[PDB]
Amino acid sequence: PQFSLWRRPVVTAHIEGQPVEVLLDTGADDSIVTGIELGPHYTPKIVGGIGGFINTKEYKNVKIEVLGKRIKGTIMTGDTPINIFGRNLLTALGMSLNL
Amino acid sequence: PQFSLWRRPVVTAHIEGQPVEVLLDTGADDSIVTGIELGPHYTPKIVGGIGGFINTKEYKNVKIEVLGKRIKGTIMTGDTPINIFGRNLLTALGMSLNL
Ligand SMILES: CC(C)[C@H](NC(=O)[C@H](Cc1ccccc1)C[C@H](O)[C@H](Cc1ccccc1)NC(=O)OC(C)(C)C)c1ncc[nH]1
Numbered sequence: 001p002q003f004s005l006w007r008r009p010v011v012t013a014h015i016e017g018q019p020v021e022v023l024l025d026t027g028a029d030d031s032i033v034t035g036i037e038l039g040p041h042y043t044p045k046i047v048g049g050i051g052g053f054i055n056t057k058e059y060k061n062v063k064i065e066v067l068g069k070r071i072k073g074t075i076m077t078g079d080t081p082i083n084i085f086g087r088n089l090l091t092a093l094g095m096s097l098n099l
Numbered sequence: 100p101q102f103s104l105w106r107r108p109v110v111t112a113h114i115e116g117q118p119v120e121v122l123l124d125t126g127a128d129d130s131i132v133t134g135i136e137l138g139p140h141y142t143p144k145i146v147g148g149i150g151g152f153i154n155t156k157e158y159k160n161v162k163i164e165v166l167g168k169r170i171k172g173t174i175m176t177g178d179t180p181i182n183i184f185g186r187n188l189l190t191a192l193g194m195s196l197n198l
Pocket residue numbers: 027028029030031032046047048049050086148149180181
């Protein structure tokens with residue numbers, strides 16, 4: 001599809017069956033979400049942005065369904081004020097920025 | 100053009116004469132640059148990032164040249180880890196996000 005950017009590109013995705021709305025972020029390296037419980041097998045991390053750093057819980061090989069595609073990829077869960085899908089999940093779907 | 104998001108979409112902008120590497124960001128409602136100072140006539144703002152709230156200096160009608168275009172926009176200066184061109188300049192340039 002084409003997101004023209006006059007509204008925030010918010011899309012509904014299913015992460016291991018849970019339904020969540022996420023912002024398609026070209027400015028983020030990772031996809032950080034909150035509100036899904038994915039289990040005790042994570043690698044602890046810390047990522048930065050406008051306002052400072054945040055501790056994350058990284059999970060690899062996660063079943064993701066977003067925009068008619070189904071991919072497997074790394075999602076981080078943490079206290080992020082906005083759910084985000086960064087370039088690691090946008091490249092898996094083959095999305096791109098066009099001029 | 101098309102940017103495939105495998106590498107961070109950073110380009111060169113010349114904000115009112117001055118050269119700056121900026122990140123093409125769809126997750127951003129505004130554009131915030133650091134390391135340039137645009138002057139005393141600004142309106143203070145607060146915007147929220149991932150680590151929390153920052154204060155920015157907002158300058159309206161800033162002439163910009165990115166890719167082959169000469170546009171005018173609102174640029175904010177503040178404490179960002181990376182210079183970002185958000186949805187207000189991307190729509191001005193006419194860029195889209197596609198799958
Ligand atoms: C939530 C994350 C995905 C996103 N942050 C990033 O993409 C940031 C952008 C950034 C660039 C340069 C310095 C600091 C931060 C990247 C992550 O913080 C850091 C970058 C970094 C490296 C070394 C020390 C400190 C930071 N990278 C990261 O976590 O993952 C990689 C893929 C590079 C290993 C962000 N963008 C906007 C708001 N938050």
